[PDB]
Amino acid sequence: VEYRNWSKPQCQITGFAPFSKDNSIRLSAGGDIWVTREPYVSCDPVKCYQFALGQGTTLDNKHSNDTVHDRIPHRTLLMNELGVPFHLGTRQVCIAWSSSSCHDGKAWLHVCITGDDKNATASFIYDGRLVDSIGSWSQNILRTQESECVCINGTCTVVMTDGSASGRADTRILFIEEGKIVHISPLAGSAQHVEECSCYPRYPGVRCICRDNWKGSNRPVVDINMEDYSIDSSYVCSGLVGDTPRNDDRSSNSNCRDPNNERGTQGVKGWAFDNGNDLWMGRTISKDLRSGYETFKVIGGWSTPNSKSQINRQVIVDSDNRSGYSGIFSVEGKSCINRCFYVELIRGRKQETRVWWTSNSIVVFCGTSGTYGTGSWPDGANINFMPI
Amino acid sequence: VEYRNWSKPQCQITGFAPFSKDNSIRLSAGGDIWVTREPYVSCDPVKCYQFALGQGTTLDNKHSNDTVHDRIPHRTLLMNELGVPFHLGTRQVCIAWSSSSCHDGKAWLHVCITGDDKNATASFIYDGRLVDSIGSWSQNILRTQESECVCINGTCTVVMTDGSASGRADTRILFIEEGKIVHISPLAGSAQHVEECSCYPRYPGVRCICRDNWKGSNRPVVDINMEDYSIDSSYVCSGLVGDTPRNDDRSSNSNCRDPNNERGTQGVKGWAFDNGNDLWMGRTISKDLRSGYETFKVIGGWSTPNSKSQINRQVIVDSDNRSGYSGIFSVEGKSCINRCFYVELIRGRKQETRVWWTSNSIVVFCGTSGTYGTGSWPDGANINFMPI
Amino acid sequence: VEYRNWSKPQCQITGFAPFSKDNSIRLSAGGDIWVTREPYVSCDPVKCYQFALGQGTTLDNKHSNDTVHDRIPHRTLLMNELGVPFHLGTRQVCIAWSSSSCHDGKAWLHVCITGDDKNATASFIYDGRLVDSIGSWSQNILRTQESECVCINGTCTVVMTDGSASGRADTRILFIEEGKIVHISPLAGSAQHVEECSCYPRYPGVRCICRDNWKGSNRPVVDINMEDYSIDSSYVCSGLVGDTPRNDDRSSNSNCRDPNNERGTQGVKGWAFDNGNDLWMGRTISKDLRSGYETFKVIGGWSTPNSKSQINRQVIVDSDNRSGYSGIFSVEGKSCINRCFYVELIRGRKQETRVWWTSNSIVVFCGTSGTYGTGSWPDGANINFMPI
Amino acid sequence: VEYRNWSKPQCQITGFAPFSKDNSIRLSAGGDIWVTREPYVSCDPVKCYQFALGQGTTLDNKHSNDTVHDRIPHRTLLMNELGVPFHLGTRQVCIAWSSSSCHDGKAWLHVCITGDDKNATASFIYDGRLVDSIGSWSQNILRTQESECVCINGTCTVVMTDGSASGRADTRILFIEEGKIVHISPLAGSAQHVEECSCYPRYPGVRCICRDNWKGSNRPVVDINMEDYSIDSSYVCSGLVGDTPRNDDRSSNSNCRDPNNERGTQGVKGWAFDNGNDLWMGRTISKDLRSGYETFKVIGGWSTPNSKSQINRQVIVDSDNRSGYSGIFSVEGKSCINRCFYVELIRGRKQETRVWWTSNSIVVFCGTSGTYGTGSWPDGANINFMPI
Ligand SMILES: *[C@@H]1O[C@H](CO)[C@@H](O[C@@H]2O[C@H](CO)[C@@H](O[C@@H]3O[C@H](CO[C@H]4O[C@H](CO)[C@@H](O)[C@H](O)[C@@H]4O)[C@@H](O)[C@H](O[C@H]4O[C@H](CO)[C@@H](O)[C@H](O)[C@@H]4O[C@@H]4O[C@H](CO)[C@@H](O)[C@H](O)[C@@H]4O)[C@@H]3O)[C@H](O)[C@H]2NC(C)=O)[C@H](O)[C@H]1NC(C)=O
Ligand SMILES: *[C@@H]1O[C@H](CO)[C@@H](O[C@@H]2O[C@H](CO)[C@@H](O[C@@H]3O[C@H](CO[C@H]4O[C@H](CO)[C@@H](O)[C@H](O)[C@@H]4O)[C@@H](O)[C@H](O[C@H]4O[C@H](CO)[C@@H](O)[C@H](O)[C@@H]4O[C@@H]4O[C@H](CO)[C@@H](O)[C@H](O)[C@@H]4O)[C@@H]3O)[C@H](O)[C@H]2NC(C)=O)[C@H](O)[C@H]1NC(C)=O
Ligand SMILES: *[C@@H]1O[C@H](CO)[C@@H](O[C@@H]2O[C@H](CO)[C@@H](O[C@@H]3O[C@H](CO[C@H]4O[C@H](CO)[C@@H](O)[C@H](O)[C@@H]4O)[C@@H](O)[C@H](O[C@H]4O[C@H](CO)[C@@H](O)[C@H](O)[C@@H]4O[C@@H]4O[C@H](CO)[C@@H](O)[C@H](O)[C@@H]4O)[C@@H]3O)[C@H](O)[C@H]2NC(C)=O)[C@H](O)[C@H]1NC(C)=O
Ligand SMILES: *[C@@H]1O[C@H](CO)[C@@H](O[C@@H]2O[C@H](CO)[C@@H](O[C@@H]3O[C@H](CO[C@H]4O[C@H](CO)[C@@H](O)[C@H](O)[C@@H]4O)[C@@H](O)[C@H](O[C@H]4O[C@H](CO)[C@@H](O)[C@H](O)[C@@H]4O[C@@H]4O[C@H](CO)[C@@H](O)[C@H](O)[C@@H]4O)[C@@H]3O)[C@H](O)[C@H]2NC(C)=O)[C@H](O)[C@H]1NC(C)=O
Ligand SMILES: *[C@@H]1O[C@H](CO)[C@@H](O[C@@H]2O[C@H](CO)[C@@H](O)[C@H](O)[C@H]2NC(C)=O)[C@H](O)[C@H]1NC(C)=O
Ligand SMILES: *[C@@H]1O[C@H](CO)[C@@H](O[C@@H]2O[C@H](CO)[C@@H](O)[C@H](O)[C@H]2NC(C)=O)[C@H](O)[C@H]1NC(C)=O
Ligand SMILES: *[C@@H]1O[C@H](CO)[C@@H](O[C@@H]2O[C@H](CO)[C@@H](O)[C@H](O)[C@H]2NC(C)=O)[C@H](O)[C@H]1NC(C)=O
Ligand SMILES: *[C@@H]1O[C@H](CO)[C@@H](O[C@@H]2O[C@H](CO)[C@@H](O)[C@H](O)[C@H]2NC(C)=O)[C@H](O)[C@H]1NC(C)=O
Ligand SMILES: *[C@@H]1O[C@H](CO)[C@@H](O[C@H]2O[C@H](CO)[C@@H](O)[C@H](O)[C@H]2NC(C)=O)[C@H](O)[C@H]1NC(C)=O
Ligand SMILES: CC(=O)Nc1ccc(C(=O)O)cc1N
Ligand SMILES: CC(=O)Nc1ccc(C(=O)O)cc1N
Ligand SMILES: CC(=O)Nc1ccc(C(=O)O)cc1N
Ligand SMILES: CC(=O)Nc1ccc(C(=O)O)cc1N
Ligand SMILES: [Ca+2]
Ligand SMILES: [Ca+2]
Ligand SMILES: [Ca+2]
Ligand SMILES: [Ca+2]
């Protein structure tokens, strides 16, 4: 082998074509299916896998009660080929309530984090062996991407954050070769708060569109120079704006520089990416709840400090349906490299309360440069059919 | 590798020997088995797989209610090795309520179609990556083969149709290399209506025996020149005649040229193939319902404009049992290339109403040039044993 | 590759060491497990598989009622690695109520037989493709080994029988190269009746110890010359004697030549093999029912016309437990080639009637040239725990 | 290939990072999961597998009653990739109520032991074939490691014991090449009693830390010279002391030479390993029951005849939770070779009696040379949710 260096143009794109969907929640109504959440999908150089954090349990299981809770000793990183759902024959790849995987182009990397919330620990598993670990630097829930990392020439990159969600916290960027931490850099540039990044290979470095829980509903940006380990950070220019909750596109703002203090705390994992001067982005259809999903292009969304000019929209899930998290993945074609994405469709509690559990399913679309139509592909589970 | 060019004689044949059967419906009576329909089977250069459209659900599942409906956001293309049935550990290969797969002799192609009925979209997935897509040209249910495509030298061929089922509609033929559409040709020749084709490699081009919903109970023919992209279309000569519903072989007709207006609308997916001047064909045993299946040879069925001379008959499923769809697949031997076929045996609703779901099973036979006996191999599920 | 030519000495042996067991019946008491019978195990040049005839159903399944019956359209040849039991994720390899498999040392051969009892048909599947078939010559239940065939240099051998079980019937020996029948020879020598053979590679030819349903409780022998296709047949010399029912070893007889007319009809599948002049053999512990299993060596059992001198006995299943069929398999070591065997342990109806189904499990032992102890390894299922 | 010779330094280590956990017991509450106990994990040169002794049954199964009993004809050696739990699709690799596996660096070795307690027999399975066997030398429960063996240059080593648990018994050390016993050596040195060894490759020979049931709560040591087959045996120097039951570290003792007669009988499988002069070790947190697990380093624990100086502690399972067995496994890195371990967490009867079955789950940690935090990862199954 050689390593993945990702030196091809981004493919020009027109929108997004359907790719995959697993129907996980419908299946659990008469099936032995894992309770999960925070999915992602990533690809080795020949095929793609889906990943998720299990809740140490299946859905038709008295143990599935109260799985709203994010962190317990029984969450584990699941991995299957893209499209086969998480049944009992599924491999738990590590111990983890927070994770991130990628493939340098020889083996797989998994960064997995369990432990006490005040002194968690992250193990670095590469090609089978546990090659490294780190402890919690700020003693407050050590956490990572919940999506794909990226590797150029045998150096991978994850970004992690220890500290306060709704306050100043402590964000570093790890450079890791064959499972060994070979450099740590701290955040620079202007980004007030940088949780749950969605990263990708804009060749000679990496770019992430991340999540601000404190002061922002515009989304952060985190530039990583692969060669000398420099970092830069900003916010996306577009005044269309990526987070939930948010303000509404009459009364929305961003200057590409500072948070916006517009329902500026909480948030959700989401994604974006530049095209020359422009920006493709998705987001919930609701400004308030985590409902619906929509993509579009903003003209100028990358370059100019508040552009609200949107073309090529798409409704991936309709208004009247639930979604949740979301992120990006990149797959190299014969000539260019393409950008794809997934969205977690979460069901049950907090919101729906007829039942006592919390799980999700998924749907995935990939960038097309051709023609496409119109539709909407929700979870599709009648909660009345469901156990508990 | 080289590519599949299929340049070998057709094997001379005497009839058909059993090959496979999956018992899918019996198994669901105490098992966790997918709800499907429209199967097919196709083969990579070393083994064969079975394919079907799932209904986003399993049979012992409140969600299985009302699965008569053909198109929803949760249908997905399943794929297993030929003979292992669709359990929970099965990979959903794409999003689709209409499909077609083949293997050029390096990778797999899948053409998958979901969306709104008025503006569906078809994704082209080859070797993992989404390489292309197209939108709905006539804004009325974009649809395809529901069986195997065929590839010669790295150019594959699918035929698709947008428009009216019971009226004039819009039929084109796509030429696609490594997942990229490289040519589209429209239908020519005399065929009034060309749904659900069963295609195959009569070397230097491809031949399909298709389905007419509008004016015909004789079956269409669709010749495809692989080299310059010409098309021709006609109807099968034989007055024995392939569709259901149909007229009965005293009062049946075809001239090889025009539809026959003999209970000439609806139809079913079915197959045929020439042998010099002759025709091997199968069909339901019933002229009225989709019941029983039988094969035979018509002497002159290919060449002469109404031949009703049949030899080598075979009853694959008896009169008193249900069938449904059906199609052909081709597998290359050491010296010649052989032709095989499958039949979808569908159970439950509309017809049987004790239960509320709709699924099928399958049986598959391959062409033999040797001896054979007599039998009949139906689904075999006691509907009273069944859930719902 | 080259082909399997099996030119190594038989390993000298002291007895038999345990090898495998699948616990299939216990598992079905809370599991989704196939209803089967007539097992065998055979090995490709790197690992071993278990095979069985399914009943188109699983055990906790209203469809499992009345599965005493041997022949229906839903029996199918199952295949797994040795030790993983027949769950829902198991591949049905062909249509068959009678079968036999082997591996020439490049691909797998399966001979599968379904159809009407008066005009069955046997398909020949080699390396995926259906390469050949034959019809029923005597129009009375065409049937085969229900155990491993054997191949030397790319010519395999199965022996099959059409005709009467309890009367004269019609027995031939097929020679088949890459799935093509290349020679058929009829039975010669002295064997009055030759059902269910257990064959094996005594180098330059093959030897089978078979089953006589008509006139014999001594077991037949069927010698096959691989080079010119000659056949010879006799009975085993030993007066210890291999069938059930049988007479008891005070009042037992064989002359190596003719049947013995000693409770001489019915029978069971069983096995044996020469060692110089001696014979290793197993059989039920009961002369009357198919209960218990025991192995031992007879001194002179091969050469001398009624030897009742037995050493090295072993109780594989105790008197107070059920068994059934049984057969041999051969695996080549680094220096010699070894002989191993399996026994079908059948449960439920006819005999046990608390329940309405009929299935089995298995246990397998291999020849050792070392030390060993004492035990007994039965099915082990409490019928009261069982469904139905 | 070449063979595994394990000639690399031990990796210096700081402690242990989490690696894996399978959640087996929680899953059985709505899942089809094997009843087991005595796990271990071992690795081929590219990945790791988990192993366990099944009880011929699954947990939601009337057959699971009374599975406290250690030895029956239905125990079987299970094997999966590390992290996928023992479902119905799991391969039973041999017949066994006592076992040990390893991989010489070309194939897998399994030593499996079933039979009568007074005349058991151990089969030696290597690379598929049964290559050898031995009988019971002392006619009292022949037994082995219940963890990983180790192989240097194509000679493997298991240590086995026949005789009395609570008395003098008969302990030998087998040297075995490609499944053939090529040398047997008896125990020498000072070790009064040597059950259930945990062995590992301290290059040119092997070292085991074993279990004394008779006179000791300090743990034995069993040195094996790979070159001429010499043996030595002692006890661990540390006065901290490894067994359960034990005396408490105020009133604890060891001189590295003789048993200690301090609650000196029974015991549990456990592990340790030298580092220069020091000792890393784990043990239950309870001196009385098999509850909790903790690791730490003893300064001088290797070299000096009663050292009670402990640094680097870790609580792997908390006081208020159950554990059981435990052992070590070694995996070679790029430069050094690392040492890892697993602990069996056992649930149900004897102790918990609301239910009638006995199974376990597992958790596994690997040696890190980096940073780490704090936590505790128990089985996590609410016994009230459980069947029976
Ligand atoms: C590729 O594919 C599509 C396939 O659909 C091509 O065009 C399609 O055009 C129709 C045009 O109307 C469009 O349907 C419309 O949009 C809404 C869809 O469903 C909503 O329902 C709930 C609401 O929360 C959500 O789940 C979901 O997210 C949507 O918001 C319909 O609401 C809408 O109906 C109303 O308006 C139409 C005119 O647009 C009127 O015909 C009706 O009267 C109705 O409302 C009534 O009258 C007035 C005015 O609306 C009021 O008093 C009140 O509203 C009253 O009840 C409408 O029919 C399809 O979904 C289109 N799809 C897309 C994707 O455009 C598409 O162009 C093609 N294109 C590309 C670019 O790929
Ligand atoms: C390889 O294998 C076969 C193995 O069967 C070889 O030959 C077999 O020959 C017999 C000859 O009769 C044939 O059975 C006949 O065909 C019908 C089969 O079942 C039907 O049942 C229902 C009806 O809807 C459907 O499910 C199914 O699709 C079939 O239609 C039988 O109906 C028929 O019985 C009647 O006729 C026979 C004479 O043929 C009489 O013996 C009876 O009396 C009976 O009817 C009665 O008498 C008269 C006249 O029929 C009337 O008053 C009224 O009908 C009354 O009740 C018949 O027994 C096997 O299936 C043959 N099979 C094949 C495949 O040919 C075969 O030749 C060999 N060949 C090759 C070429 O491979
Ligand atoms: C490797 O392993 C074995 C491990 O067992 C080594 O030797 C063992 O020696 C004992 C010796 O007795 C043997 O047990 C005997 O055999 C019978 C086993 O169980 C039966 O039970 C039912 C009956 O249908 C069946 O399920 C099953 O197939 C067997 O037939 C016992 O029946 C027998 O008990 C009676 O006889 C003994 C003396 O042999 C007396 O101690 C008792 O009194 C009892 O019967 C009573 O007294 C008299 C005379 O018997 C009568 O009034 C009446 O019977 C009354 O109740 C006996 O204990 C182990 O199984 C041996 N095993 C083998 C494999 O030999 C073995 O040698 C070693 N060897 C090698 C060669 O590998
Ligand atoms: C990496 O991670 C850890 C993350 O926890 C870093 O430090 C942590 O520091 C706290 C300090 O207190 C420690 O918690 C303590 O230890 C016990 C943990 O739980 C027990 O509960 C049951 C008891 O059987 C078992 O299941 C289990 O095995 C443990 O034994 C607590 O018992 C303890 O609480 C009591 O003492 C504290 C002071 O230590 C007081 O705050 C309370 O008042 C309480 O008891 C009360 O007051 C007095 C004195 O105790 C008495 O009257 C009576 O006890 C009364 O109720 C305590 O809070 C975390 O678990 C630490 N973890 C570790 C791993 O050290 C850690 O340093 C960092 N380090 C490294 C080296 O990796
Ligand atoms: C980035 O990746 C590919 C991976 O090998 C490099 O591949 C070389 O690129 C061309 C044609 O692909 C030539 O430079 C070499 O002879 C190619 N080898 C192969 C196997 O493709 C590419 O050059 C690398 N680029 C950078 C910028 O490092
Ligand atoms: C069609 O396919 C096969 C695939 O390689 C071609 O194979 C060649 O055919 C013969 C013998 O098979 C010779 O022409 C070549 O040396 C063969 N190569 C191999 C690997 O078989 C065949 O010629 C191709 N035919 C056409 C008409 O394109
Ligand atoms: C039977 O089988 C083996 C399979 O190749 C033959 O192998 C040859 O036998 C020896 C050493 O094994 C030499 O004759 C050849 O150079 C060997 N080749 C290999 C790959 O082993 C063996 O000779 C064949 N015997 C007969 C009697 O045909
Ligand atoms: C132990 O194992 C390795 C396995 O091959 C041996 O490898 C050799 O070691 C070095 C570099 O690894 C050189 O001696 C050889 O050219 C190497 N070959 C490979 C494939 O690594 C190592 O020497 C063996 N050592 C002992 C002490 O036997
Ligand atoms: C990734 O690796 C290659 C290693 O060569 C880098 O490629 C350029 O690398 C050198 C620059 O010091 C040149 O000597 C090479 O010709 C050229 N490589 C090719 C294969 O085109 C590249 O800089 C590295 N990229 C990063 C982000 O570190
Ligand atoms: C496990 C963890 O703390 N990561 C998270 C995942 C999801 C959510 C969430 O938005 O519900 C929050 C957090 N913090
Ligand atoms: C999904 C789809 O529209 N294709 C079809 C499949 C089956 C039938 C059918 O004949 O029931 C009809 C159609 N149109
Ligand atoms: C299917 C078939 O006819 N072969 C058989 C298998 C088992 C038995 C049996 O002994 O129950 C009999 C037969 N004839
Ligand atoms: C099967 C067997 O005898 N080995 C054992 C395993 C566990 C225990 C145990 O400690 O419960 C004891 C023994 N002897
Ligand atoms: Ca925010
Ligand atoms: Ca029609
Ligand atoms: Ca007989
Ligand atoms: Ca002790």
> Given its phi and psi angles, is residue C239 left (phi above 0), alpha (psi -120 to 50 degrees) or beta?
alpha
Measuring CA to CA, how many Å separate B366 from each of B198, B310, C79, C123? 16, 20, 21, 10
Catalytic site residue B325? yes
The CATH number for C1-388, chosen from 3.40.50.300, 1.10.10.10, 3.40.50.150, 2.120.10.10, is 2.120.10.10
C-alpha span between C224 and C228 (Å, rounded): 9
DSSP string across A311-366: EEEEEEEEEEEE---EEEEEEE-SSSEEEEEEEEEEEETTT--SSS-EEEEEEEEE
Residue C90 Cα, gap to closest chain D Cα (Å):
9
Residue A201 and residue A253: Cα distance in Å, rounded? Answer: 28
Q: Which of C200, C193, C197, C134 is nearest to C340 (CA)?
A: C200
> Which chain C residues have a beta carbon less than 8 Å from that of B27?
57-58, 61, 88
Ligand 3 centroid distance, CA of D168 (Å)? 28
Rounded Cα distance between C265 and C246, Å, is 9
Closest CA to B331 of A4, C127, C246, A206: C127
Q: Which two three-digit tokens encode residue A175?
A: 């450079």
Distance from residue D159's CA to the centre of ligand 8 (Å): 28
Pick the residue from chain B with its C-alpha nearest to C72: B377
DSSP string for residues in A175-186: EEETTEEEEEEE
Q: D256: which DSSP letter?
A: S
Two structure tokens written together for D259: 């048993």
Residue type (1 letter), B232? D
Asked if residues D341 and D329 have their Cβ atoms less than 8 Å apart, the reply is yes
Q: How far apart are CA A282 and CA A219, in angstroms?
A: 12
Q: Which of A3, A4, A5, A157 to mutate to test the pocket of ligand 9 (most atoms within 8 A of CB)?
A: A5
Q: How far apart are CA D32 and CA B88, in angstroms?
A: 13
Q: Answer yes or no: are the C-beta atoms of C98 and C117 closer than 8 Å.
A: no
How far apart (Å, rounded) are the C-alpha atoms in residues B204 and A172? 61
Q: Is the CA virtual torsion D349, D350, D351, D354 positive or negative?
A: positive
- Rounded CA gap, D311 and D320, in Å? 23
The reply, when asked if residue D243 is annotated as ligand binding, is: yes
Q: How far is CA B19 from the centre of its chain?
A: 17
Task: Give the span between the Cα atoms of B146 and B131, in whole angstroms.
Answer: 21
User: Is the shortest distance between the CB of B81 and ligand 6 below 6 Å?
Assistant: no
Cα distances (angstroms) measured from residue D195 to each of B78, C124, D159, D216, D331: 52, 54, 9, 12, 24
How many alpha carbons fall within 13 Å on the CB side of residue A101?
A: 24
Q: Which residue of C has its CA nearest to B80?
A: C91
Residue of C123, C160, C162, C356 for testing the chain B interface, max B β-carbons within 10 Å: C123
Separation between Cα atoms, residue A178 and residue A156, nearest integer Å: 8
CB contact under 8 A, D74 and C21: yes
Residue type, A220: P
Q: Is the CB of C341 under 6 A from ligand 12?
A: no
Q: Which candidate, C131, C103, C105, places its Cα nearest to that of B332?
A: C131
Contacting subunits of C (3+ beta carbon pairs below 8 A)? B, D
Element (H, E) at D26: helix D24-27
Chains with ≥3 Cβ pairs under 8 A against D?
Answer: A, C
Which secondary structure element, helix H or strand E, spans residue D193, and what is its range? none
Residue with tokens 């979209």: B121
Question: Is the distance from CB of D38 to CB of D344 less than 8 angstroms?
Answer: yes
- Paired tokens of A37: 């959440």
Mutation choice for ligand 3 from D71, D114, D118, D119, CB with most ligand atoms inside 8 A? D119
Report the distance separating Cα B133 and Cα A368, nearest Å.
7
Q: Which atom of ligand 1 lies at the shortest distance from residue B116's CA?
A: 4
Q: CA-to-CA distance for B158 and B154, rounded, in angstroms?
A: 13
- Is the separation of the CB atoms in D158 and D113 below 8 Å? no
- Cα(A337)–Cα(A320) distance, rounded to whole angstroms? 34
Q: Three-state SS for C21?
A: strand
Distance CA D94, CA D312 (A): 40
- The helix (run of H) or strand (run of E) holding residue A25 is helix A24-27
* Residue D88 vs residues A63, C23, C27, C83, D55: alpha-carbon distances, Å: 21, 11, 8, 11, 13
CA distance B48 to chain C (A): 8
Q: Of B70, B117, B170, B318, which residue is the catalytic one? A: B70
Alpha-carbon dihedral sign for residues B62, B64, B66, B71: positive
Residue D280 CA, chain-centre distance (Å), reads: 16
- Greatest distance between any 2 Cα atoms in chain D: 56
Q: Are the CB atoms for C362 and C50 separated by under 8 Å?
A: yes
Check residue A143 and report its DSSP letter: B
CB environment C250-264: b (16+ within 10 A), e (fewer): eebbbebeebbebbb
The active-site residue, picked from C60, C70, C223, C258, is: C70
Q: Where are the domains of chain D?
A: 1-388
Q: Can you say how many angstroms the Cα of residue D365 is from the centroid of all Cα atoms in its chain?
A: 14
What DSSP assignment string belongs to B69-94?
-S--TT-EEEEEETTS---TT-EEEE
b/e burial code for range A17-39 (CB count within 10 A of at least 16 → b)? bbbbbbbbbbbbbbbbbbbbbbb
Specify the amino acid at residue B336: C
D213 contacts D267 by C-beta, under 8 angstroms: yes
D355 vs D62: CA distance, rounded Å: 12
Q: Map residue B64 onto helix, strand or coil.
A: helix
Reply yes or no: is the peptide bond before residue D186 cis, omega within 30 of 0: no
User: Residue D59 in contact with residue D28, Cβ under 8 Å?
Assistant: yes
Residues in CB range of A311: below 8 A, 6 or more apart: A296, A297, A299
In C71-214, which ranges are E strands? Answer: 76-81, 91-95, 99-103, 108-114, 121-126, 129-135, 150-152, 155-163, 169-177, 180-186, 195-200, 205-211
Whether residues D370 and A136 touch (CB distance < 8 A) is answered with: no
Nearest CA to ligand 13 atom 12: D70
Q: How many C-beta atoms surround the C-beta of residue C11 within 10 A?
A: 17
Resolution (A): 2.4
* Catalytic (active site) residue D70: yes
Residue A134, CA distances (Å) to A123, A162, A175, B156, D20 in order: 7, 12, 13, 52, 17
- Structure obtained using: X-ray
Query: Is the backbone peptide bond immediately before C387 cis, with ω within 30 degrees of 0?
Result: no
In order, the DSSP letters of A47-97 are: -EEEEEEEEEEESSSGGGTTTT-S--TT-EEEEEETTS---TT-EEEEE-S
Write the DSSP assignment of C190-249 as a string of letters. T-S--EEEEEE--TTEEEEEEE-SSS-SSPEEEEEETTT--EEEEE-S-SS---SS---T
Residue of A nearest to B32 (CA): A31
CB contact under 8 A, B88 and A27: yes
3-state secondary structure of C63: helix
